[model samples]
Target: SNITYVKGNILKPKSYARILIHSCNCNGSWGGGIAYQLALRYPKAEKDYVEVCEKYGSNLLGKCILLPSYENSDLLICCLFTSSFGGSSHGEKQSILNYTKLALDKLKTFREAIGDYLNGHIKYPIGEYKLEMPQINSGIFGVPWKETERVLEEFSGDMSFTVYQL
Candidate 1:
């Protein structure tokens, strides 16, 4: 028997936006898929995304930068990369790993900036965190599912929310 499972809906005005990082191999083109979706939904995001690539180079495509999407805006601030393009599937394992680390580090930087910009009044619920899923290797692009789950469980104790591996 096939059973359908439904996850909760996105918050009306999402307080926190999740940015998925990927190693790019397609230069700087957002021709299709998720990147395309982002471009279509938020044209300005694409501009910022490209500018980051221009300034940092494709090597930075793995890094993530979050932007704030204020109320009533169609776009919200989320992390964007400046790497190659196509994502982890088209890149070398070493390159992907390096970018992954870079992305995580960038996330931390952005989190701090957010705190500072708000005069320390807005503390992010969960300080910068990382989640990797092995199953994503086959489809998305993540660490091993079980290992990632275990690590997330051990690492996310401070937060009230739970992490799930799809």
Candidate 2:
């Protein structure tokens, strides 16, 4: 199975309770680009995410961490720690792709356990969660989009990631 592409944004799939995944560095700074954009939208979520990074350090790279949005529990944030620091992290394409696979695999492990708690922000338990992202690792990470796409598709469509474009 292949990922479904959408020329859209992260307020994505508007109908599904989704996990928005993205490339993250272990340095605890969402200073620029998409990370910064997301941080501003969910400060409490960002704070918790950063705290996890600070605690784990570079140990986070090649790993994924799931954080529930403090503002909206129905929505979850999944960070794929693929680099040591946030800005201009340079990794080989193969390594980047491998990291992504590892992260996505980790995501699958936790998917079944998510309970849709009816928090103040959501009406019901968000049941069907879609895996979502932007063209990851191609921005500041500098991996080519095509390369990332190749790596993404290699999962045999096990994870159908929905991409959001500006």
Candidate 3:
């Protein structure tokens, strides 16, 4: 397992069950950036995302929440609550990093469920499930990719992550 960078779309990966990870705010709005793209791609998932914010409130910062696609169980979207609200450039750098770490940490422990749905219950305790994403926090959130890459290195040993650059 390793962390690799590539040029492509995280939403259209080679693997059908790839997990698309991205930073999200605790506020229930997917109005811009990658979040907006995701919301558009999976409109039904947005409802669950909003529901997640409603349930957790501000405590959602430094946390991770996974929403299985309502239309397709094979697809999972991981929301990392890095900011308190949605929109352009609303989060501090360190807080965004903290939230990213917390979210990856959450994913690290979610082997059972992640494995179960990712590959049709074929593998239990899947340490290296196929995961993909854009350069998180590098756009609207304004955190540098190197900063986010450092955080990812702390966790992506057992599971390799493919980062997409568009």
Candidate 4:
């Protein structure tokens, strides 16, 4: 198992550098669920997301990118683009799950390369962040949590995820 469960609001303050990761659609709308709340709290990060979507569009599916939350210097928002569009008409379960797996692999690759990059707020090396997230695609994206959990387990030796449940 690569996941640890924790109960609390994921938006709350933490003492260490951490990333709040979430599933995203390539359509550029943070219209619902945790994505909506994040938009309300971190407008600048939302700007970055929309811009990324505009530039990459559906090409973003099966990929991951890290952006800064200007409001919180210690936190970063990781976008896992798993679907082409969000809402009632999202991608199929298996497709989204496959993209999720690919995105996670990309994230692992980025974790290795993040040491030389600046995330706008602060700088930190890989492995320093407690890879945190809510029950991602299980919410609006409609994938079952167990399915995503199984995906996480596939990377058990390479990474650990701290899943927040409210």
TM-score of each: 0.52, 0.83, 0.85, 0.94
The residue pairs that clash in candidate 2, if any, are 1-157
| Candidate 3 C-alpha lDDT tens digits along 5-82 | 888767663545656788888889898888888888888779878877888777888877766665565667788888
Which TM-score value belongs to model 1?
Answer: 0.52
Candidate 2 regions with alpha-carbon error over 4 angstroms: 112-127
lDDT of 1 at 109: 57
Candidate with maximal lDDT:
4
Residue 124, model 2, lDDT: 38
Candidate ordering by TM-score (highest first): 4, 3, 2, 1
Name the candidate, 1 or 4, with the larger lDDT value: 4
Alpha-carbon lDDT, every model: 0.41, 0.73, 0.75, 0.87
Candidate 2 lDDT tens digits, 80-138: 87777767555666777788778777776665341222234443333366778898888
lDDT of 4 by residue, 4-116 (tens): 99999998889899988899999999999999999999998899899899998999999888888888778888899999999987999999999999999998987766221
lDDT: the better of candidates 1 and 3? 3
Off by over 4 Å in 4: 114-120
Clashing pairs in 3: none
What is the lDDT, from 0 to 100, of the residue 100 in candidate 2?
A: 78
Ranking by lDDT: 4, 3, 2, 1
- Per-model root-mean-square deviation over C-alphas: 7.1, 3.4, 3.4, 1.8
